[PDB]
């Protein structure tokens, strides 16, 4: 097994979810995610997407292996992937500023990964449509070629159109609250429409776009890194804090005045806005976002 042969070198993240480690396998770095015994359903879900759907793309974090052992005494659950030494988009944006080329390359690579997840491809290379449900800057990793890939499919839901089957799962985990869409916060989300879940991803994508664009330099000016809604909610905000801001007050992240002196940041401001409509059916699709980014 890949797991018995791996040496854990350093913990690069710990949380409610479990732990992610840098490890060594056959002389190469790998990333190991060790799940809490209480998050067992996430491990299975992510595993079965990778091992049964054969989900593979430049902009989706690359699967190597998955291992589990269980006795009455204890259960260990490991997901092993490629290691990206630059870390998350969240870590990266704190240390670094961007130019037009490197900003476009980041947001274009996210949109490609998301569109690949959302689109149903039939038959031989087959794949159902997949919604992520926890998109955020921490779940995006930065590669050395300046592109990004999307990680963490523990909450993903699938839909096949050859069948009429929606696979939600029975997972007690739910999204990161800061990135939750209006319809999730006010509970008007159409829980039996698969498209509802894609539109929730598009909302979160818009917030990530905002995060990245802030760090693009324009006419000698740049903002510091902030997470969405930094000015109106505390760290680790509650469901209710987010509901007041997003539903009741209808707030969206502020667009700095300086962006409208730059053609690219101007084009990105318009996309962001079309991800954030209160009405989910009015939001753009992942494919359209990709096409619009391609046009610049
Ligand atoms: C976002 O979730 C994941 C991320 C990674 C992952 C893969 N490759 C590199 C990193 C990574 C490396 C360094 C950092 N740093 C941030 C803090 N200080 C510097 C190091 C962060 C993330 C993380 C692997 C995962 O499943 C295996 C995983 O869950 C599916």
XYZ file of C-alpha atoms and ligand atoms in Angstrom:
326
model
C 0.000 0.000 0.000
C 1.106 3.575 -0.652
C 0.346 4.539 2.981
C 2.533 2.061 4.902
C 5.426 3.372 2.728
C 4.969 7.103 3.473
C 6.944 9.207 5.924
C 5.106 12.165 7.496
C 7.502 15.130 7.555
C 5.449 18.284 8.438
C 1.912 19.269 9.289
C 0.825 22.068 6.927
C -2.811 22.379 8.192
C -4.943 21.297 11.159
C -8.639 21.982 11.793
C -12.090 20.561 12.497
C -11.762 18.480 9.262
C -8.530 16.676 10.246
C -4.912 17.307 9.265
C -2.931 17.773 6.045
C 0.739 16.752 5.994
C 3.709 16.998 3.730
C 5.096 13.464 3.362
C 7.682 11.497 1.395
C 6.892 8.534 -0.808
C 9.492 6.801 -2.959
C 11.650 9.882 -2.634
C 8.962 12.392 -3.837
C 6.807 14.784 -1.832
C 3.138 13.942 -1.438
C 0.311 15.519 0.491
C -1.525 13.376 3.034
C -4.920 14.279 4.424
C -5.826 12.437 7.596
C -9.522 12.617 8.368
C -11.219 12.694 11.782
C -13.064 9.357 12.464
C -16.235 11.594 12.608
C -15.613 12.871 9.032
C -15.577 9.375 7.553
C -18.349 10.202 5.011
C -16.248 13.014 3.499
C -13.334 10.619 3.039
C -15.536 8.091 1.268
C -17.188 10.643 -0.937
C -13.944 12.168 -2.094
C -12.380 8.733 -2.557
C -15.225 7.344 -4.660
C -15.161 10.434 -6.907
C -11.454 9.940 -7.533
C -11.410 6.071 -7.699
C -14.731 5.467 -9.511
C -15.285 8.602 -11.589
C -11.618 8.898 -12.585
C -11.726 12.618 -12.099
C -8.580 14.130 -13.581
C -7.712 17.604 -14.913
C -4.871 20.189 -14.841
C -6.987 22.287 -12.448
C -8.224 19.663 -10.063
C -5.908 18.441 -7.329
C -4.367 15.189 -8.470
C -5.259 11.969 -6.738
C -2.530 9.409 -6.006
C -4.185 7.051 -3.499
C -6.603 6.445 -0.668
C -6.219 4.156 2.340
C -8.274 3.096 5.287
C -7.753 0.669 8.195
C -10.245 0.021 10.887
C -10.449 -2.016 14.100
C -12.689 -1.612 17.238
C -9.731 0.188 18.940
C -9.292 2.715 15.985
C -9.790 3.851 12.372
C -7.330 5.785 10.201
C -8.464 7.369 6.944
C -5.928 8.829 4.508
C -6.256 10.617 1.180
C -2.952 11.019 -0.680
C -2.423 13.595 -3.444
C 0.172 15.587 -5.279
C 2.021 18.158 -3.188
C 2.078 21.824 -4.190
C 4.827 23.498 -2.246
C 3.411 26.988 -2.789
C 0.399 26.124 -0.638
C -3.084 27.568 -0.956
C -4.218 30.591 -2.871
C -5.040 32.055 0.537
C -1.365 31.699 1.715
C 0.060 32.864 -1.587
C -1.987 36.055 -1.846
C -0.745 37.219 1.476
C 2.889 37.284 0.473
C 2.581 38.266 -3.208
C 1.178 40.794 -5.627
C 0.043 40.095 -9.179
C 0.254 41.612 -12.617
C -2.364 41.346 -15.321
C -0.941 38.174 -16.828
C -0.574 36.332 -13.519
C -3.967 37.483 -12.208
C -5.694 36.272 -15.424
C -3.829 32.975 -15.290
C -5.033 32.290 -11.730
C -8.740 33.132 -12.204
C -8.826 31.453 -15.643
C -7.411 28.235 -14.172
C -10.045 28.217 -11.360
C -12.838 28.769 -13.867
C -11.539 25.866 -16.003
C -11.439 23.463 -13.045
C -14.900 24.554 -11.921
C -16.360 24.250 -15.446
C -14.798 20.767 -15.690
C -16.485 19.783 -12.442
C -19.899 21.222 -13.502
C -20.102 19.809 -17.044
C -21.394 16.278 -17.706
C -19.132 14.340 -20.160
C -20.737 11.089 -21.480
C -19.685 7.424 -21.898
C -16.036 6.217 -22.365
C -14.202 9.076 -20.418
C -17.503 9.320 -18.541
C -18.289 11.806 -15.733
C -21.422 13.047 -14.017
C -21.849 16.719 -13.334
C -20.347 17.663 -10.006
C -20.923 20.561 -7.670
C -18.181 21.336 -5.134
C -20.115 23.090 -2.289
C -17.130 24.443 -0.386
C -15.177 26.643 -2.809
C -12.896 29.144 -1.098
C -9.316 30.398 -1.373
C -8.033 27.839 1.156
C -9.361 25.025 -1.088
C -7.454 26.245 -4.087
C -3.732 25.398 -4.452
C -1.146 27.284 -6.436
C 1.257 25.459 -8.783
C 4.748 26.496 -9.945
C 3.498 27.184 -13.507
C 1.304 29.955 -12.071
C -1.874 28.022 -12.480
C -4.189 26.790 -9.709
C -6.110 23.662 -8.926
C -9.211 23.054 -6.865
C -9.122 20.759 -3.837
C -11.390 19.099 -1.292
C -14.389 17.228 -2.790
C -15.724 15.948 0.589
C -19.063 17.718 0.168
C -19.369 17.235 -3.601
C -22.737 16.240 -5.113
C -23.284 14.507 -8.412
C -25.951 14.315 -11.034
C -26.171 12.072 -14.084
C -28.587 13.027 -16.952
C -28.670 9.503 -18.502
C -30.224 8.461 -15.182
C -32.249 11.102 -13.376
C -30.337 10.611 -10.196
C -29.087 13.224 -7.732
C -26.459 11.959 -5.295
C -26.285 14.235 -2.266
C -25.032 11.777 0.401
C -25.862 11.995 4.145
C -22.904 14.164 5.233
C -23.284 16.148 8.523
C -20.514 18.655 7.425
C -21.788 21.856 5.612
C -20.041 24.737 3.801
C -17.762 27.383 5.180
C -20.136 30.068 6.425
C -18.277 33.119 5.048
C -18.718 31.778 1.521
C -22.393 30.657 1.789
C -24.854 32.007 -0.764
C -28.027 34.010 0.152
C -30.348 31.147 -0.672
C -28.424 28.806 1.696
C -28.436 31.361 4.488
C -32.200 32.132 4.217
C -32.988 28.493 3.397
C -34.818 29.221 0.152
C -32.398 27.047 -1.812
C -34.193 24.561 -4.066
C -32.735 21.452 -2.482
C -34.084 19.076 -5.193
C -32.651 21.017 -8.209
C -29.060 20.010 -9.040
C -28.575 23.463 -10.635
C -29.100 25.038 -7.232
C -25.816 23.522 -6.095
C -23.888 24.823 -9.099
C -25.199 28.301 -8.511
C -23.990 28.188 -4.931
C -20.485 27.411 -6.372
C -20.745 30.446 -8.641
C -21.507 32.745 -5.712
C -18.385 31.478 -3.934
C -16.335 31.800 -7.106
C -17.226 35.497 -7.263
C -15.945 36.073 -3.779
C -12.656 34.335 -4.715
C -12.364 36.465 -7.820
C -12.627 39.539 -5.523
C -9.956 38.159 -3.251
C -7.538 37.716 -6.175
C -8.259 40.984 -8.010
C -7.454 43.014 -4.938
C -3.888 41.837 -5.239
C -3.386 42.806 -8.823
C -1.325 45.973 -9.181
C -2.763 48.808 -11.223
C -1.160 52.208 -11.836
C 1.152 51.719 -8.885
C -1.742 50.752 -6.508
C -2.754 47.566 -4.738
C -4.914 46.508 -1.788
C -3.796 44.190 0.995
C -5.196 40.699 1.267
C -8.603 40.433 2.928
C -11.197 37.668 3.163
C -14.681 38.452 1.879
C -16.787 40.436 4.342
C -13.737 41.224 6.522
C -15.228 44.573 7.533
C -18.708 43.415 8.595
C -18.281 40.064 10.417
C -15.851 38.587 12.974
C -13.391 35.756 12.421
C -15.209 32.431 12.342
C -18.606 34.121 11.839
C -21.855 32.439 12.692
C -24.717 31.433 10.409
C -26.723 34.349 11.816
C -23.913 36.931 11.381
C -23.774 35.951 7.696
C -27.545 35.944 7.263
C -27.843 39.546 8.591
C -25.136 40.800 6.223
C -25.972 38.914 3.011
C -29.734 38.460 3.188
C -31.162 41.169 5.419
C -28.730 44.002 4.488
C -27.940 42.680 0.959
C -24.262 43.536 1.246
C -21.708 42.573 -1.323
C -17.921 43.077 -1.213
C -16.900 46.638 -2.087
C -15.388 47.331 -5.401
C -12.541 49.859 -5.110
C -12.812 52.958 -7.215
C -9.341 52.459 -8.677
C -10.321 49.266 -10.526
C -12.378 51.269 -13.043
C -9.216 52.975 -14.284
C -7.972 49.539 -15.406
C -9.578 47.576 -18.277
C -8.926 44.140 -16.821
C -10.061 44.899 -13.266
C -13.039 46.670 -14.862
C -13.897 43.395 -16.755
C -13.432 41.388 -13.501
C -15.690 43.768 -11.507
C -18.516 43.073 -13.970
C -18.030 39.273 -13.661
C -17.958 39.417 -9.873
C -21.258 41.333 -9.904
C -22.868 38.753 -12.209
C -21.911 35.988 -9.745
C -23.613 37.795 -6.828
C -27.222 38.408 -7.936
C -29.692 37.544 -5.160
C -31.630 35.523 -7.727
C -29.632 32.300 -8.397
C -31.001 31.774 -11.936
C -29.543 35.139 -12.982
C -25.984 34.209 -12.120
C -23.552 33.213 -14.851
C -22.488 29.636 -15.436
C -18.986 28.314 -14.982
C -18.671 27.875 -18.747
C -19.677 31.458 -19.481
C -17.236 32.805 -16.901
C -14.503 30.792 -18.557
C -15.400 32.112 -22.011
C -15.537 35.681 -20.788
C -12.103 35.324 -19.098
C -10.747 33.737 -22.262
C -11.925 36.848 -24.284
C -9.457 38.968 -22.292
C -7.245 22.160 0.667
O -7.229 20.844 0.997
C -6.119 20.038 0.688
C -4.798 20.563 0.401
C -3.737 19.679 0.115
C -2.334 20.235 -0.204
C -1.552 19.733 -1.244
N -0.362 20.266 -1.461
C 0.163 21.288 -0.717
C -0.596 21.815 0.332
C -0.077 22.888 1.185
C 1.282 23.003 1.409
C 1.767 24.079 2.265
C 0.858 24.976 2.910
N 1.316 25.995 3.759
C 0.523 27.005 4.429
C 0.979 27.411 5.842
N 2.389 27.595 5.970
C 3.130 27.227 4.797
C 2.637 25.885 4.271
C -0.458 24.817 2.707
C -0.948 23.764 1.825
C -1.836 21.283 0.608
C -3.963 18.260 0.146
C -5.233 17.786 0.478
O -5.517 16.432 0.515
C -4.406 15.638 0.429
C -6.310 18.664 0.759
O -7.557 18.104 1.060
C -8.151 17.406 -0.004
